[PDB]
Amino acid sequence: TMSLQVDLLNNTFANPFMNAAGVMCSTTEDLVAMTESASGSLVSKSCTPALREGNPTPRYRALPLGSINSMGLPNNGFDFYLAYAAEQHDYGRKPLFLSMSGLSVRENVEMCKRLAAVATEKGVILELNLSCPNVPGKPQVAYDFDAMRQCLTAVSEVYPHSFGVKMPPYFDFAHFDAAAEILNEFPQVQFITCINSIGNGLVIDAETESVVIKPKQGFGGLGGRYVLPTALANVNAFYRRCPGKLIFGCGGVYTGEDAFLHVLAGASMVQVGTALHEEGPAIFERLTAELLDVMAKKGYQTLDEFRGKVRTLD
Amino acid sequence: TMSLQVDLLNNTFANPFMNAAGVMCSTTEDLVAMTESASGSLVSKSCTPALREGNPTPRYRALPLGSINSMGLPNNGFDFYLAYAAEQHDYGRKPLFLSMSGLSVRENVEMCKRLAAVATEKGVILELNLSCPNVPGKPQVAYDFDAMRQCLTAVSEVYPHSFGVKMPPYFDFAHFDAAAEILNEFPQVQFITCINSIGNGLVIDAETESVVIKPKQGFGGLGGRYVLPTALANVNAFYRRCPGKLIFGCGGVYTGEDAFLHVLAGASMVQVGTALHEEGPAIFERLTAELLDVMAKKGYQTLDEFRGKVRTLD
Numbered sequence: 282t283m284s285l286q287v288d289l290l291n292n293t294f295a296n297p298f299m300n301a302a303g304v305m306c307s308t309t310e311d312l313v314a315m316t317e318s319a320s321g322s323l324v325s326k327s328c329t330p331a332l333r334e335g336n337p338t339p340r341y342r343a344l345p346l347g348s349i350n351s352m353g354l355p356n357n358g359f360d361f362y363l364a365y366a367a368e369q370h371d372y373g374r375k376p377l378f379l380s381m382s383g384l385s386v387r388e389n390v391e392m393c394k395r396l397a398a399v400a401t402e403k404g405v406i407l408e409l410n411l412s413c414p415n416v417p418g419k420p421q422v423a424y425d426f427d428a429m430r431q432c433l434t435a436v437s438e439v440y441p442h443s444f445g446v447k448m449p450p451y452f453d454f455a456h457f458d459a460a461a462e463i464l465n466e467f468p469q470v471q472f473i474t475c476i477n478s479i480g481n482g483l484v485i486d487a488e489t490e491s492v493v494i495k496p497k498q499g500f501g502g503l504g505g506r507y508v509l510p511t512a513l514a515n516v517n518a519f520y521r522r523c524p525g526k527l528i529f530g531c532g533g534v535y536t537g538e539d540a541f542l543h544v545l546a547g548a549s550m551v552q553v554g555t556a557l558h559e560e561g562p563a564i565f566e567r568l569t570a571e572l573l574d575v576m577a578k579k580g581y582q583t584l585d586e587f588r589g590k591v592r593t594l595d
Numbered sequence: 596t597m598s599l600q601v602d603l604l605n606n607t608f609a610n611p612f613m614n615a616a617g618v619m620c621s622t623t624e625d626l627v628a629m630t631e632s633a634s635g636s637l638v639s640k641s642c643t644p645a646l647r648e649g650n651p652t653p654r655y656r657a658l659p660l661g662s663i664n665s666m667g668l669p670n671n672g673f674d675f676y677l678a679y680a681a682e683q684h685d686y687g688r689k690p691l692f693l694s695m696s697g698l699s700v701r702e703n704v705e706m707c708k709r710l711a712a713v714a715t716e717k718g719v720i721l722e723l724n725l726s727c728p729n730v731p732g733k734p735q736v737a738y739d740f741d742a743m744r745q746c747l748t749a750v751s752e753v754y755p756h757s758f759g760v761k762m763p764p765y766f767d768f769a770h771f772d773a774a775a776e777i778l779n780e781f782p783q784v785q786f787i788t789c790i791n792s793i794g795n796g797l798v799i800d801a802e803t804e805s806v807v808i809k810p811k812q813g814f815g816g817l818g819g820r821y822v823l824p825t826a827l828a829n830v831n832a833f834y835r836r837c838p839g840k841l842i843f844g845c846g847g848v849y850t851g852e853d854a855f856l857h858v859l860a861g862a863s864m865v866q867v868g869t870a871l872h873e874e875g876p877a878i879f880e881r882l883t884a885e886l887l888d889v890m891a892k893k894g895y896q897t898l899d900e901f902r903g904k905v906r907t908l909d
């Protein structure tokens with residue numbers, strides 16, 4: 282007998298699967314579809330105070346090895362997602378995360394001030410996005426450590442709940458250490474989601490001699506097969522460095538076996554982006570079955586048995 | 596009539612292709628084989644003052660979508676590659692680049708002082724490596740802008756020739772801007788090689804529940820198909836921001852079409868890493884034939900006709 286149950290943040294989850302923020306979670310229809318799905322949870326589209334129409338199209342392209350996008354935080358605005366969390370979402374079915382991506386610290390502070398009461402009353406969980414690489418003129422906050430600390434301090438002052446942070450990928454141990462040091466100063470940061478896309482790739486089509494997305498001269502965030510080893514590295518790097526926290530994996534998940542790798546690396550929840558974008562929410566039924574099959578073959582009955590237990594050779 | 600000829604740095608190259616500095620270039624056998632091959636050029640293994648055995652083996656793993664390695668700068672030491680450049684290399688056949696990766700500025704200055712005479716007398720060309728992601732306790736210098744400026748000042752002061760720099764990938768426009776600003780301070784930096792590996796990825800084998808390389812708990816640099824969009828982005832970002840310099844592309848080249856994409860992005864020379872590691876030096880016969888096939892289809896006669904002319908949709 283086997284179980285995909287996960288218990289964290291004073292919630293029970295049927296399985297570790299959810300959408301990545303930004304995928305299939307922008308509209309009422311999207312959010313109801315995610316809640317009706319076999320996923321263990323869901324997160325709403327990264328929001329800004331005001332509605333944003335996003336960058337000009339084409340701004341997404343599916344590729345053999347994944348995806349490239351420069352959406353530009355298209356979203357219905359904070360009021361819309363707050364209302365969903367406050368009044369609409371079926372918490373009897375599954376827990377809800379709300380992704381927030383204010384364009385300034387002050388914007389995040391004002392949104393969190395209002396979110397706090399809905400968190401208390403309804404149990405929505407904040408995922409604060411420190412890593413959006415597609416708003417022109419605005420670098421990833423988590424690539425400026427002083428800015429990241431400033432943001433976390435300001436939010437912690439006004440948001441008296443456990444919350445998580447969505448991180449951009451890092452590529453060296455000095456940065457893993459610096460980032461972990463900052464996050465470890467905030468006991469209220471109870472989870473870390475690794476990773477947002479690999480930022481500012483450039484896909485060029487040989488036939489047309491052209492980039493494949495319109496905004497930002499074709500530069501956009503990479504997802505899918507391109508990012509799995511980077512995602513696993515970041516998941517494991519923070520798993521090792523942040524023993525007091527949960528790690529959520531995001532990046533490169535197409536199968537239950539990919540999910541198995543994220544959990545081995547340290548993941549508690551597993552988010553699905555590009556694959557969900559191309560398959561839709563039916564994907565969750567397949568991922569749960571596939572993960573259970575992998576576990577069956579290996580003789581694992583629960584996720585606790587192998588989470589973080591990636592074997593090293595040195 | 597068509598031509599792959601490239602003229603730069605007071606040399607003529609038969610075609611844009613060469614090896615990447617970690618691959619097929621450590622031993623005399625390697626270097627002679629690269630010289631006998633169809634490549635336009637070659638670069639010797641990134642060197643340190645003393646011979647280095649490198650990180651514990653096994654430390655390179657070929658993957659379906661590219662490679663991961665934590666080599667640790669294994670090399671025969673500067674004297675060995677300097678001797679090759681001074682005494683042995685057939686400059687009648689093609690130009691030679693020498694990759695240098697001192698573990699401190701002092702080490703780079705010491706080697707450059709000695710390299711200067713052989714550059715003068717034989718015409719070997721320096722590629723200064725600011726981007727090695729595999730030496731434990733040693734972060735990428737190019738990820739610390741102050742350190743990078745200091746290194747370039749110290750090297751420029753002692754080395755009376757043009758040279759180039761091998762860069763790690765960047766992932767946001769603020770970093771492209773800052774890095775380009777620094778490089779633009781140094782008129783002796785006449786080429787920029789983009790990119791070194793995507794650092795500190797983590798591959799996990801689901802079957803064995805294990806990392807696939809021994810050093811650094813399985814963390815190593817990614818090469819091959821994983822890195823093409825990141826490589827193109829960096830090539831193009833520096834092509835745009837450093838109009839007074841040449842860009843060399845490195846990353847994800849397996850075919851003439853991949854090379855065509857690098858050239859469209861702005862590459863002058865195109866370096867081949869993982870694909871060469873797996874195919875060997877005969878690869879250059881295929882790549883040149885393939886790139887001429889792409890040009891023929893499109894009615895291009897020379898690389899100058901399309902270098903840097905990637906089309907945007909904005």
Ligand SMILES: Cc1cc2nc3c(=O)[nH]c(=O)nc-3n(C[C@H](O)[C@H](O)[C@H](O)COP(=O)(O)O)c2cc1C
Binds near residue numbers: 326533534554555556
């Ligand atoms: C279309 C699209 C929109 C995205 N927008 C957001 C966003 O709103 N907030 C966020 O944290 N990440 C967003 N991202 C990043 C994803 O959450 C995820 O981190 C990334 O795509 C990697 O997962 P994957 O390899 O499964 O795609 C977006 C990704 C895609 C494909």
Ligand SMILES: Cc1cc2nc3c(=O)[nH]c(=O)nc-3n(C[C@H](O)[C@H](O)[C@H](O)COP(=O)(O)O)c2cc1C
Binds near residue numbers: 664694724819848
């Ligand atoms: C086994 C191996 C060793 C490498 N060692 C070096 C090095 O000595 N110096 C360097 O600049 N790059 C080194 N690299 C990085 C490559 O030069 C290149 O930047 C990277 O592999 C991307 O090219 P690819 O996608 O064609 O592999 C090494 C790569 C490999 C696979």
Ligand SMILES: O=C(O)c1cc(=O)[nH]c(=O)[nH]1
Binds near residue numbers: 351415416477502
């Ligand atoms: O909507 C976007 O532009 C976006 C946000 C984000 O956080 N990540 C991403 O790849 N795109």
Ligand SMILES: O=C(O)c1cc(=O)[nH]c(=O)[nH]1
Binds near residue numbers: 665667668729
């Ligand atoms: O030999 C290595 O460690 C090595 C050096 C380098 O510069 N890049 C890389 O991926 N490996």
Ligand SMILES: [Cl-]
Binds near residue numbers: 338
């Ligand atoms: Cl689109």
Ligand SMILES: [Cl-]
Binds near residue numbers: 341342
């Ligand atoms: Cl598409």
Ligand SMILES: [Cl-]
Binds near residue numbers: 312313369371
């Ligand atoms: Cl609902």
Ligand SMILES: [Cl-]
Binds near residue numbers: 654655
């Ligand atoms: Cl090996």
Ligand SMILES: [Cl-]
Binds near residue numbers: 626683
């Ligand atoms: Cl020779």
Ligand SMILES: [Cl-]
Binds near residue numbers: 684685686687
């Ligand atoms: Cl000669």
Ligand SMILES: [Cl-]
Binds near residue numbers: 819847867870871
């Ligand atoms: Cl290659």
